[PDB]
């Protein structure tokens, strides 16, 4: 008998297009649906568009493309979250299914001129202004300079229509004035929940004529390193010449906010060629604590702090350099990469990231599976390294403590983290499964990815099996769905997909199959996969020099400067003297920054699996119901577990 | 390495007249050139430097202009004085080097030779060799023949010349010309003649002397 | 006042040495460079080497580099070019000049220089002049010198210790077949002036030590 | 000099701002290998230092994108880096260091470094002298020069220094500013802290307020003044305490099961929770996927329901059973309620309707119960049987008027069936003792809009404390009488009596159900569900604030509404004055008035965390050479841990290499051997570093300084000292041989001071009569006259010459008459040269730009261009020398007379 269903995203955005993909699997000849879209409770239609039909032609699957605008109940209407009735009527039978509605409209970035500013001095920022696929729009947006303690001091509210969206704007900061981190928050009209900021230090000062860095051998401080905390200091002037001059450098512990310093460790090194090394010694850290666990100062993090002031008196410069944590491994692993979930009777591939303690990806670095020696791979580029665990059909959860295995290192140096993978369970208990698999190498929009399919459904019935639905989200919406077809017998099929600038930053593959056979029972399997891509521009944007660079200019002098962007592209420019950062660097707006926000607004929350087909779709962010009963849980939660 | 080059090699051009030479690199040099002048037989002079800045001293119609790839001296209303080669030199890459040089020759009217003639000395004639000369004095333009009658019988290959460098003030050529015997041969012949031929004058002008006798 | 001084110059031996000097005056040598530039007979310009005299460095052409060296005395604000292995193409009168740094980058023009000294390298032997009168014939009178039979160059004639320097025309040095040079020197003055007026020419030949003051006077006969 | 270039010539650099280039450009030249390409030309500033260029770029189909940062490093082989301060205060003396630089690799410069006058600042550079030292910079390497300073004028002021090397075509020169600022500090205060609040003692009269202005008497002359207000707007608007918690009635959603009457008690609740879940949006919290499946609990109650219905359109416990009116009547309030959450028959529900009007009515209207249902409780207030034909009408009544919006034309006479009914309960309001007969029957008056005047005024009063309709004994009888007319509350729109009334049932927190609570429950959901719909969206917050400054033209009658998301405002005073402030209708706000000012100083500025005493003197028996001794010690019996000392050199002077070395031997001193490296000549900055120094002493040292260079005037030296984790806290002497303090000649009272570094009077061989006439025009000349000097009062700072006048060759601005006394004024340093004596007569002449004060502070200065000359006695005159002399001042003084200046 015939199968009606439906596929939307978990949440529904306003205003931007959200796609619902629709099937009608057992089906005979032309069948029409019009898709429906209602506010709830109760029902005044609100974009009861989109009619179509599904034909014999495209294998009885098609899609429907819908627009909610911000009306009049949703607007005003805020605290609480709010949701929509979707419902598709196939023919006759109707489908439908409550989905949550985010207020969320899109994205505002923020960039100001300077990171810092003295009073008397105007600020110069620009709003940036994109839909969910960080493309430009035109809206109308509120913006708040907000002084240090939350007042509101100037505001605006202008519309990037006609603007190519980017809001060029500006505020004179009086001279009277108060004296720490300003804010601009800006919202979307439509918003006001979804505020976003940018912070820029207020204070008076002058530029210093060089720069210091304070860099550590190691970014870490291994506690039973009797060598001590070894730090090197630079100075450089600005134009690039090294320094002269005398260095005192200070050494203290931060435990969370609090701060404690060790005078102890204060030193007076020269400085000579811009160069200089420092040592904090174990006993004058040891001696600095009042407890005297060495192993109490795990957790808590070091800071050094460099003064620097020139042979000549006429200058100096502070630079410090803190977050070095105290640790007892040079490593850290991770799960945050892995599924939580297997298939019971196939290998659980279980995922380990091990980083340095700054979080940066390791390399080279050995991973081991408690109880068993050599069950390894060194960990790659990525950082990521691949433990596959046979599994029996016993639906006990697994129990995987992972270590690291570092030979230099000694035992109590070795990483150390414990997961716990719970079982997809079958309907009915059918036995019958999906798996994907992919392979783990960064991808660039240009080059391939196999996606494999393995139909793990046994013999009587397999043969009912025609084709997998295979669904992809990037960027917390529908981006494509197709069709994998199987044919009789093919335990196994590879969809070569190829990955184009829209898979930018990542992407979940989620697939599914359905039919009756175990029992007189309408079955759905589904898996879903997360794969990461290189987070790159979508286009290009590149600045250098035309002028016949090696040459170094001079003051007051013409140069040329090329620009390398996207045909008939907008591009806003800045040029900052780097002084300005030895005061303070903070806020500055990045592209990797950009994608950062993206990826934290997603609303799939796995790195792939479930614990059953409803959970397998619900987890990469997608609502599935069917005419038969069978549909994803209520997703009420704007934001993910936890 | 960086190649410079100057042109043109010569140029001629009257009083009061626009000239420019120019001097070109085969990559960016930026402002890097200075440009010299040179009278005969003395030390060159600074006049441009930085590309277009006026040495201190030289006149307001000296003046230097380009950048990069492409550089002017320009002299605005050429003189008499500015009879000279000059010269582009660049500092740009690490060893300097001065480019092959403009030649700049003036132009004016037609003036015709004041003709002497120097009979051998007697103090000379006591070391065995008889030099006689011939002076075309101040003279436009350099294009001249002197021809030696002996005794009315004409000669080469026994004559020596030396024209003047320009003058500086009057744009004027003098040329000297020098008849080479042994005592023994000098004192057989008897008329010696020197004959000019040149421009301005209408026909060959002819200067001599009767050996001897005053 | 800045003025630079060259000496030293004269014949040579083809592979022999030779030290020419620079005396720098009128401003701190330590401050600057000196450049030594060259010219050979009736060509162009060639830049033969620096000196920075705060602390001795140099800089050579390629056409010079294993020949030729330039030191400096600071004490005597004096630089100095010694040349070795000297060549047949290395005859050429030497100058020195001031570089001064105009632009930004170590850009440098030459503002002042010195007179030059000239350098000739041959196996000819020295050779000092025959000066003999050119006599005014008996109204403008012109009269002169002839130097002859002399080698290497240069020779400086002047006319009654340069008080008469008008109208004067000191012709070009001609390589003779004999393979020694000989010139003249004529100028012209007032006929009237003849018989009042003295008139004695100054040759003077550095490289043999000879100097000649020859008085030019009509005959008797 | 020669070989150099020229001061005038030297074009200083000016353009270093933080930041530039804040630039639009769109890519239009066409895309080669699909990357489009644009050059730019641009202009760098004058900062040497390295730009970094950002670019981001925007498009409508590949988005937005960030490219990597680019750099570019401007340069010089030779430049100067002017080091000033953020700010200075004005008339204190400070120092500031140019740092000049030779990046040249083989060759030092010669240089001739200068500062520039401005008449801002007090320094050695002056109107006729120029300031300028001759330096050797090595390779590779910098150079200090100290400038002493002092700011004159306040606000923004502008420093220049430039420089020439000799020997080469090499200049440069540096135009910095530097904000001048007064004494003081910033000073937050408030005045008034109001609350704008009518019909809370702001009465009918829409809220007339006064609030007056600062004090500020004790303020520094010279500064601004800025008021700020803050008009808040602390919202409890949107007249919406918040609802009944959501977690709270679990209980409500009931399974209806039993007869007809036990059917209609648990179908209640559940309808009654939905209505009220429906219109406050808590289906989040509670359970989204529960409505499905408690929505089939109402149409499980309603499919029952309709079981019970009797052929003629009624309802009752039993088929069997007489119909009931009451029961008809509450089935379609509870049917009219339900028409939005599930599907109701349209037969169904206007057909009890037609049942009730035809069938149960008697001739004034009273809708009277023909059978008493078994389960009484469930009636509510109607259970007792006081007055039981009064509220029943108004019950069965109310179930029509919340279904007449839907049976119009079906049930014909319906209106007349109201209007009658309406008569009844009407009429008879005024006799209506309990509390609950008073508000049911107010209700369906107030649906109509015929609830008015006493009828009114008995609905108002009869609620006990003006919140609640309670009556003697249950309590549930009295939250169902108020929920009632909170209804009739809301359709009145009335919003003055709705706020006491919903919070009354905040605090009972009645969350229904249990038994015998049916009219309790479906009253109190209904009239609090009503409540959230009808309840101000926007309240208000309208107030009509019109401040009027009488330093203003115009008034500004600022706007105040709930919904800018701001609430708040500032104004910018100028002046300090008086101003009203009136306010106007409803809300609520703040009201603050806060100005801004700088005070008085208070002894306690400069040297906050240090002592510091520094001496020059000369040397011992043995060209010229003395004794630099610094004296220091820091605040609080705790010593300082790693301090600097930063010693600048007088001109011309340079420490004792032996004694430096002596002393950096030392144990708790340092002093870097790059420093001990150094040239004799060139090494006229220091540094000391000290390991530490407390308060229990005085840590002191001194060592040799020896004049190698020989110049005048020579600028005095500064000593600066500083623990290393506080440059700020700093503290700073200066000295000099023959001024101690080493403080430039400045004259200085109240708040301005004159640079004192110019001469004493015009300076004296001739002194003809021709020579003064002249002189004595000269352009600022605004008087002459002869005085008599009556009392010489010296000081330290400024001796006060008091002069008598006998006469006035020349009047000026200063307008005094023969006899009258003006005050002349002199620097200390000046009365050696001077000898002004008393009772001695004088001839003097001088500026405009020489009167300090104000008006009749009048003072004279005896400035650089102040001309002043000794006078003898009228009798001594007649002597044989100084006849001459007598004779010229009174030839001078009648040509001055007679014919004056010739301008
Ligand atoms: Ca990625």
């Known amino acids: 008998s015939p199968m009606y269903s439906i596929i939307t995203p978990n949440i529904l955005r306003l205003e931007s297009e959200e796609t619902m993909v629709l099937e009608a699997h057992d089906a005979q000849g032309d069948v029409p649906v019009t898709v429906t879209v209602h506010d709830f409770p109760g029902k005044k239609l609100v974009l009861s568009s989109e009619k179509t039909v599904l034909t014999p032609a495209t294998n009885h699957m098609g899609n429907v493309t819908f627009t909610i605008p911000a009306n009049r109940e949703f607007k005003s209407e805020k605290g609480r979250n709010k949701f929509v009735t979707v419902q598709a009527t196939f023919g006759t039978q109707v489908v439908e299914k409550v989905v949550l509605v985010s207020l969320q409209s899109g994205y505002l970035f923020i960039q100001t001129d300077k990171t810092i500013y003295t009073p008397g001095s105007t600020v110069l920022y620009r709003i940036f202004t994109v839909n969910h696929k960080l493309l430009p729009v035109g809206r109308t947006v509120m913006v708040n300079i907000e002084n240090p303690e939350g007042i509101p001091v100037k505001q605006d509210s202008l519309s990037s229509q006609n603007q190519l969206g980017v809001l060029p704007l500006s505020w004179d900061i009086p001279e009277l004035v108060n004296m720490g981190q300003w804010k601009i928050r800006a919202y979307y009209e439509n918003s006001p929940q979804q505020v976003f900021s940018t912070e820029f230090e207020v204070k008076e000062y002058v530029l210093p004529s060089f720069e210091v860095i304070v860099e550590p051998t190691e970014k870490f401080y291994y506690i039973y390193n009797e060598k001590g905390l070894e730090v090197t200091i630079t100075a450089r002037f600005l134009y690039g010449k090294k320094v002269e001059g005398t260095a005192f450098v200070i050494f203290g512990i931060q435990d969370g906010e609090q701060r404690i310093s060790l005078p102890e460790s204060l030193k007076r090194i020269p400085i000579e060629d811009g160069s200089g090394e420092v040592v904090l010694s174990r006993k004058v850290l040891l001696d600095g604590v009042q407890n005297p666990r060495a192993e109490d100062l795990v957790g808590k993090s070091l800071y050094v702090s460099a003064t620097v002031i020139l042979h000549s008196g006429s200058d100096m410069v502070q630079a410090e350099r803190s977050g070095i944590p105290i640790v007892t491994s040079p490593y850290q692993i991770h799960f945050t990469k892995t599924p939580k979930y297997f298939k019971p009777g196939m290998p659980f591939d279980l995922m380990v990231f091990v980083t340095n303690p700054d979080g940066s990806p390791a390399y080279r670095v050995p991973v081991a599976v408690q109880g068993e020696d050599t069950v390894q791979s060194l960990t790659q580029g990525d950082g990521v390294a691949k433990l596959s665990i046979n599994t029996h059909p016993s639906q006990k959860p697994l129990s995987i403590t992972v270590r690291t295995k570092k030979q230099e290192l000694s035992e109590a140096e070795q990483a150390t983290r414990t997961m716990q993978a719970l079982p997809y369970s079958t309907v009915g208990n059918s036995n019958n499964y999906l798996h994907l698999s992919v392979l783990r190498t960064e991808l660039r929009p240009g080059e391939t990815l196999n996606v494999n399919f393995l139909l793990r459904m046994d013999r009587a019935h397999e043969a009912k099996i025609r084709y997998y639905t295979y669904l992809i989200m990037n960027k917390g919406r529908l981006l494509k769905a197709g069709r994998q077809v199987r044919e009789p017998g093919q335990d196994l099929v590879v969809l070569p997909l190829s990955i184009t600038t829209d898979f930018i930053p990542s992407f979940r593959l989620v697939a599914y199959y359905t039919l009756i056979g175990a029992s007189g029972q309408r079955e759905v399997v589904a898996d879903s996969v997360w794969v990461d891509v290189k987070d790159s521009c979508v286009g290009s944007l590149v600045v250098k020099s035309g002028q016949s660079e090696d040459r170094q200019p001079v003051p007051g002098q013409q140069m040329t400067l090329k620009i390398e962007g996207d045909h008939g592209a907008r591009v806003v420019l800045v040029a900052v003297d780097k002084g300005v950062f030895v005061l303070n660097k903070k806020n500055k707006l990045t592209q990797s920054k950009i994608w950062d926000v993206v990826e934290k607004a997603d609303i799939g929350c796995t790195p792939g699996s479930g614990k059953d087909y409803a959970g397998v779709f619900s987890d990469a962010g997608l609502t599935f119901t069917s005419s038969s009963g069978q549909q994803t849980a209520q997703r009420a939660e704007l934001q993910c577990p936890q | 390495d960086i190649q410079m080059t100057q042109s043109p090699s010569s140029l001629s051009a009257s009083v009061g007249d626009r000239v420019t030479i120019t001097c070109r690199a085969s990559q960016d040099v930026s402002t890097a050139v200075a440009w010299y002048q040179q009278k005969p037989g003395k030390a060159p002079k600074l006049l441009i430097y930085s590309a277009s800045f006026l040495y201190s001293g030289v006149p307001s119609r000296f003046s230097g202009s380009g950048s990069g790839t492409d550089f002017t001296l320009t002299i605005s209303s050429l003189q008499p004085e500015d009879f000279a080669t000059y010269y582009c030199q660049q500092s740009y890459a690490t060893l300097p080097t001065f480019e092959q040089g403009t030649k700049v020759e003036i132009k004016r009217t037609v003036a015709a030779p004041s003709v002497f003639i120097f009979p051998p000395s007697d103090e000379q004639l006591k070391s065995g060799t008889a030099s006689v000369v011939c002076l075309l004095n101040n003279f436009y333009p350099r294009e001249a023949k002197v021809q030696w009658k002996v005794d009315n019988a004409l000669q080469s290959g026994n004559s020596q010349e030396s024209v003047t460098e320009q003058d500086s003030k009057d744009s004027t050529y003098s040329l000297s010309s020098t008849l080479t015997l042994s005592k023994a041969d000098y004192e057989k012949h008897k008329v010696y003649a020197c004959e000019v031929t040149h421009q301005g004058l209408s026909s060959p002008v002819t200067k001599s002397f009767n050996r001897g006798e005053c | 006042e800045v003025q630079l001084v060259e000496s030293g110059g004269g014949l040579v031996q083809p592979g022999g040495s030779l030290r020419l000097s620079c005396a720098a005056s009128?401003?701190?040598?330590?401050?600057?460079?000196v450049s030594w530039v060259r010219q050979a007979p009736g060509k162009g310009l060639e830049w033969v080497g620096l000196?920075?005299?705060?602390?001795?460095?140099?800089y050579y052409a390629d056409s010079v580099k294993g020949r030729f060296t330039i030191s400096a005395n600071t004490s005597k604000n004096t630089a100095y070019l010694q040349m070795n292995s000297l060549r047949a193409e290395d005859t050429a009168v030497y100058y020195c000049?001031?570089?001064?740094?105009?632009?930004?980058?170590?850009?440098?023009?030459?503002?002042?220089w010195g007179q030059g000294t000239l350098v000739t390298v041959s196996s000819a032997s020295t050779k000092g002049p025959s000066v003999f009168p050119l006599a005014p014939s008996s109204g403008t009178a012109a009269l002169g010198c002839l130097v002859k039979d002399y080698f290497p160059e240069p020779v400086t004639v002047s006319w009654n210790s340069g008080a008469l320097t008008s109208g004067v025309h000191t012709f070009p040095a001609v390589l003779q077949s004999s393979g020694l040079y000989s010139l003249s020197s004529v100028v012209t003055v007032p006929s009237s002036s003849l018989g009042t007026q003295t008139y004695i020419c100054n040759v003077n030949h550095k490289p043999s030590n000879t100097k000649v003051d020859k008085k030019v006077e009509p005959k008797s006969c | 000099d020669e070989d150099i270039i020229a001061e005038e010539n030297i074009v200083s650099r000016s353009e270093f701002p933080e930041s530039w280039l804040w630039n639009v450009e769109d890519l239009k030249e066409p895309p080669k290998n699909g990357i489009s390409t644009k050059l730019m030309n641009i202009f760098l500033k004058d900062s040497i230092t390295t730009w970094e260029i950002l670019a981001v770029s925007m498009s409508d189909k590949k988005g937005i994108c960030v490219a990597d940062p680019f750099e570019v490093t401007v340069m010089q082989d030779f430049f100067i880096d002017l080091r000033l301060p953020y700010s200075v205060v004005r008339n204190e003396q400070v120092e500031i260091r140019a740092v000049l630089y030779n990046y040249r690799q083989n060759q030092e410069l010669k240089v001739r470094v200068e500062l520039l006058h401005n008449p801002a600042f007090c320094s050695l550079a002056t109107t006729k002298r120029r300031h300028q030292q001759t330096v050797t910079i090595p390779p590779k390497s910098s150079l200090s020069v100290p400038y002493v300073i002092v700011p004159l004028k306040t606000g923004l002021q502008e420093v220049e220094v430039k420089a020439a090397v000799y020997h080469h075509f090499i200049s440069d020169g540096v135009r910095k500013s530097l904000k001048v600022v007064p004494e003081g500090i910033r000073m937050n205060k408030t005045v008034a802290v109001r609350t704008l609040d009518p019909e809370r003692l702001g009465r009918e009269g829409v809220q007339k307020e006064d609030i007056p202005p600062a004090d500020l008497s004790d303020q520094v002359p010279d500064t601004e003044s800025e008021t700020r207000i803050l008009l808040q707007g602390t919202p409890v608007a949107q007249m919406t305490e918040d609802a009944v918690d959501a977690e709270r009635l679990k209980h409500l959603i009931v399974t209806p099961s039993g007869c007809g009457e036990q059917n209609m008690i648990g179908m209640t609740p559940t309808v009654i929770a939905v209505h009220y879940l429906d219109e406050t949006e808590q289906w989040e919290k509670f359970g989204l996927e529960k409505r499905q499946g408690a929505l089939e609990l109402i149409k499980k109650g309603y499919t029952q329901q309709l079981a019970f219905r009797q052929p003629s359109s009624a309802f009752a416990a039993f088929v069997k059973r007489a119909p009931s009116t009451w029961l008809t009547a509450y089935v379609v309030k509870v049917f009219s309620l339900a028409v939005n959450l599930i599907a109701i028959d349209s037969q169904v529900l206007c057909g009890a309707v037609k049942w009730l009007i035809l069938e149960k009515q008697k001739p004034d209207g009273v809708f009277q119960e023909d059978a008493p249902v078994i389960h009484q409780e469930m009636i509510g207030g109607l259970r007792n049987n006081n007055e039981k034909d009064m509220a029943l009408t108004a019950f069965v009544l109310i179930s029509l008027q919340e279904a007449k919006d839907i049976c119009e034309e079906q049930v014909n006479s319906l209106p007349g069936s109201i209007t009658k009914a309406g008569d009844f309960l009407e009429a008879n309001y005024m006799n209506l003792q309990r509390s609950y007969t008073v508000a049911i029957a107010g209700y369906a008056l107030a649906q109509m809009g015929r609830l008015k005047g006493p009828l009114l005024n008995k609905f108002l009063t009869t609620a006990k404390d003006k919140n609640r309709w309670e009556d003697p004994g249950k309590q549930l009888y009295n939250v169902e009488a108020t929920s009632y007319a909170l209804l009739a509350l809301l359709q009145l729109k009335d919003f003055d009596f709705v706020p006491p009334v919903v919070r009354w049932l905040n605090e009972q927190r009645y969350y229904g159900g249990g038994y015998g609570s049916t009219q309790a429950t479906f009253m109190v959901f209904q009239a609090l569900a009503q409540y959230q719909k009808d309840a101000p969206d926007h309240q208000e917050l309208n107030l009509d604030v019109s401040l009027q400054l009488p330093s203003r033209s115009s008034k500004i009658t600022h706007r105040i509404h709930w919904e800018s998301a701001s609430l708040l405002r500032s104004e910018e005073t100028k002046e300090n004055e008086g101003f009203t402030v009136t306010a106007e209708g409803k809300g609520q706000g703040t009201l603050s008035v806060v100005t801004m000012y700088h005070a008085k100083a208070k002894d306690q500025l400069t040297c906050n965390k240090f002592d510091l005493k520094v001496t020059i003197k000369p040397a011992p028996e043995t060209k010229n050479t003395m004794i630099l001794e610094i004296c220091t010690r820091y605040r609080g019996d705790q010593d300082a841990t790693m301090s600097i000392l930063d010693i600048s050199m007088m001109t011309g002077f340079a420490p004792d290499t032996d004694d430096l070395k002596q002393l950096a031997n030392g144990v708790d001193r340092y002093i870097s051997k790059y420093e001990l490296d150094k040239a004799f000549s060139d090494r006229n900055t220091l540094i000391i570093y000290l390991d530490k120094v407390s308060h229990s002493e005085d840590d002191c040292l001194a060592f040799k300084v020896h004049q190698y260079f020989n110049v005048e005037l020579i600028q005095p030296g500064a000593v600066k000292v500083y623990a290393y984790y506080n440059l700020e806290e700093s503290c700073t002497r200066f000295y000099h041989p023959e001024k101690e303090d080493g403080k430039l000649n400045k004259l200085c009272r109240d708040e301005l001071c004159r640079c004192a570094e110019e001469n004493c009077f015009i300076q004296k061989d001739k002194v003809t009569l021709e020579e003064r006439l002249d002189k004595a025009c000269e352009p600022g000349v605004d008087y002459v006259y002869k005085t008599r000097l009556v009392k010489v009062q010296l000081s330290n700072d400024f001796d006060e010459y008091i002069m008598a006048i006998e006469q006035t060759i020349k009047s000026g601005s200063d307008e005094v008459q023969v006899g009258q006394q003006r005050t002349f004024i002199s620097p200390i340093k000046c009365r050696e040269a001077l000898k002004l004596e008393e009772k001695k007569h004088y001839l003097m002449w001088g500026l405009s730009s020489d009167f300090w004060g104000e008006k009749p502070n009048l003072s004279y200065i005896i400035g650089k261009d102040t001309w002043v000359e000794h006078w003898p006695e009228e009798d001594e005159c007649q002597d044989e020398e100084n006849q001459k002399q007598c004779q010229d001042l009174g030839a001078f003084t009648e040509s001055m007379v007679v014919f004056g200046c010739p301008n």
């Open positions: 000049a001031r570089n001064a740094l105009y632009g930004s980058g170590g850009y440098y023009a030459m503002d002042y």
């Open positions: 009128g401003f701190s040598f330590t401050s600057s460079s």
């Open positions: 000196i920075y005299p705060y602390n001795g460095f140099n």
